[PDB]
Amino acid sequence: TRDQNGTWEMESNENFEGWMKALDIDFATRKIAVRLTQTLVIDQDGDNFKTKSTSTFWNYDVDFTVGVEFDEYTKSLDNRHVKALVTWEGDVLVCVQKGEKENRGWKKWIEGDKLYEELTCGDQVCRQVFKKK
Numbered sequence: 001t002r003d004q005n006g007t008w009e010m011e012s013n014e015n016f017e018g019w020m021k022a023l024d025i026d027f028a029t030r031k032i033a034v035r036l037t038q039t040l041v042i043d044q045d046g047d048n049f050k051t052k053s054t055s056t057f058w059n060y061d062v063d064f065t066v067g068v069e070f071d072e073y074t075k076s077l078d079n080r081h082v083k084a085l086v087t088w089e090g091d092v093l094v095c096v097q098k099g100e101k102e103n104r105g106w107k108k109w110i111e112g113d114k115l116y117e118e119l120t121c122g123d124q125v126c127r128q129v130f131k132k133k
């Protein structure tokens with residue numbers, strides 16, 4: 001299934017700090033952020049997505065249309081400019097953010113009843129699992 005709508009509550013997080021470090025996020029922010037449970041809210045209608053990632057320490061939203069490149073400022077995460085593109089590979093939603101960092105982006109897929117995601121930057125992969133609230 002390609003339908004990723006829902007309020008997704010984190011069950012598992014792995015190597016979130018490695019991903020943040022590859023983005024050069026500073027020590028103090030990483031030390032706090034690595035402790036935190038996350039939520040991911042996805043509003044999906046056709047190609048049109050609204051995605052929110054939140055914890056007690058951040059609340060980041062991004063809107064996009066599958067298949068349409070968008071020039072993006074990454075805002076409070078790392079204040080960088082990238083050319084972002086989200087597409088489907090089978091039932092995997094793949095985002096590539098072209099810019100200074102290599103291998104940068106994320107992937108999301110439904111597996112069983114859960115939402116799995118990968119967060120990538122450089123040689124680092126963060127793996128996460130969420131349950132649908």
Ligand SMILES: *C/C=C(\C)c1ccc(-c2ccc(OC)cc2)s1
Nearest residue numbers: 051053058059060062076077106
């Ligand atoms: C589809 C998944 C997305 C858009 C994200 C997963 C983690 C995100 C994130 C954004 C910003 C911060 O710090 C401000 C932390 C995590 S976004």
